[PDB]
Scaffold this active site. Structure first.
Site, short mmCIF file in Angstrom:
data_model
loop_
_atom_site.label_atom_id
_atom_site.label_comp_id
_atom_site.label_asym_id
_atom_site.label_seq_id
_atom_site.Cartn_x
_atom_site.Cartn_y
_atom_site.Cartn_z
N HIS A 206 21.08 14.44 -43.05
CA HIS A 206 22.01 13.32 -43.14
C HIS A 206 23.32 13.71 -43.82
CE1 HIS A 206 19.46 9.87 -41.69
NE2 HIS A 206 18.63 10.90 -41.68
N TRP B 227 14.04 23.33 -32.60
CA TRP B 227 13.61 24.07 -33.79
C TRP B 227 13.82 23.27 -35.08
CZ3 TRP B 227 16.97 28.66 -31.70
CH2 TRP B 227 16.38 29.12 -30.53
CA LIG Z 1 28.33 15.30 -45.50
#
Ligand SMILES: [Ca+2]
Ligand code: HEM
Ligand SMILES: [Ca+2]
Length: 330
Positions: free
Chosen positions: A47, A164
């Site tokens: 994130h 992956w």
């Molecule tokens: Ca960032």
């Protein structure tokens, strides 16, 4: 180099990481465990990093999700990330590395606590974040496959690299997809970095583990397991299905491709030649426990074959009747 307490590292700037390692192992990861805080810290690496586009902007792996938390934790795609951001913040404040560095370090350390895990390369020296990421740069589980692949592509990843990276879902659960069943994992072994994720997503769905009608979710094959819409589709899409299947029962490939692609992710928005290699700080992971299998009661006929070039490998099933997966303790 030799650091203050006699531990050694190739480049001495990296000595700052030893007290940080000791501190997070004891006080963030509950004694070097592969549980909720490790999983959330790994989720955070993504994130933070994926907020990068050569045209839409964003500084990538820059700590922005912490430094500019009041902006970023409010993006819909970041729902639930506030908990781990709040947990890491006092560690960043206390120690002497940038937020960007801290997030990637904590992720790498955490993965090294998991049986079957791998040592992710780690570089020091990311500057402080300049601005919040733009919104709408983090993939969502209800996004079209082509949308996810293009977004990841824009950030720099091939379709196989997406597969992956999604090895991360081998050590992973959801709290917000279905809020009635928080802590429900994506595979039957959320404490083990293994191929069970790639196997179990390939099975025909059977049931919703909680409520029906949640956005970004489809039917799972097992009580106590949740299946993302995106993961369902990536296991089946021609761009990714053969690579997904190739992970099954191939622990060394899972390890090596995850470490290399995580390194690349950790460096989004950054220049490796402007950082210091501190990879030798990451601990040695425990050995894999368990072997690749179908869940109890299942057989090869329950696998949905989606790779056009190669049949799915026959795997033995655990013995006994269908059982259900325990949630990850919060
Ligand atoms: Ca960032
Ligand atoms: C490719 C697109 C991806 C999508 C759509 C996706 C989606 C999700 C969703 C919806 C959750 C559950 C959040 C919640 O409800 O609590 C989740 C959890 C997680 N994701 Fe992914 N993800 C993706 C890629 C990745 C990548 C590249 C990583 C690499 C670090 C990652 C690591 C994790 C981890 C470790 C968790 C578990 C968090 C926990 O157990 O506390 N994800 N992901
Ligand atoms: Ca697993």
């Amino acid at each position: 180099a030799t650091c203050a307490d006699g531990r050694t590292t190739a480049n001495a700037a990296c000595c700052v990481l030893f007290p940080i390692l000791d501190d997070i192992q004891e006080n963030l990861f509950d004694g070097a465990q592969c549980g909720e805080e490790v999983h959330e810290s790994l989720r955070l690496t993504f994130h933070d990093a994926i907020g990068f586009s050569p045209t839409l902007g964003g500084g990538g792996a820059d700590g922005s999700i912490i430094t500019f938390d009041t902006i970023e934790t409010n993006f819909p795609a970041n729902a639930g990330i506030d908990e781990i951001v709040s947990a890491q913040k006092p560690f960043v404040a206390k120690h002497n590395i940038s937020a960007g560095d801290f997030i990637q370090f904590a992720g790498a350390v955490g993965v090294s606590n998991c049986p079957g895990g791998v040592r992710i390369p780690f570089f020091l020296g990311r500057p402080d974040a300049v601005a919040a990421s733009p919104d709408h740069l983090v993939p969502e589980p209800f996004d079209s496959v082509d949308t996810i692949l293009a977004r990841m592509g824009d950030a720099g990843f091939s379709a196989v690299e997406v597969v992956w990276l999604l090895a991360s879902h081998s050590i992973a659960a959801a709290d917000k997809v279905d809020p009635s069943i928080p802590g429900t994992p994506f595979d039957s072994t959320p404490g083990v970095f293994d191929s069970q994720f790639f196997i179990e997503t390939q099975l025909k769905g059977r049931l919703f583990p909680g409520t029906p009608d949640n956005k970004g979710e489809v039917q799972s094959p097992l009580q106590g397991e949740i299946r993302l819409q995106s993961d369902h589709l990536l296991a089946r899409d021609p761009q990714t299905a053969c690579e997904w299947q190739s992970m099954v029962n191939n622990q060394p490939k899972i390890q090596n491709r995850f470490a290399g692609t995580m390194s690349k992710m950790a460096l989004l928005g950054q220049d490796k030649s402007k950082l210091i290699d501190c990879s030798d700080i990451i601990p040695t992971p425990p050995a894999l426990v368990g072997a690749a299998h179908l869940p109890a009661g299942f057989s090869l006929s329950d696998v949905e074959q989606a790779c056009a070039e190669t049949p799915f490998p026959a795997l033995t099933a655990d013995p006994g009747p269908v059982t259900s997966v325990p949630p990850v303790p919060g």
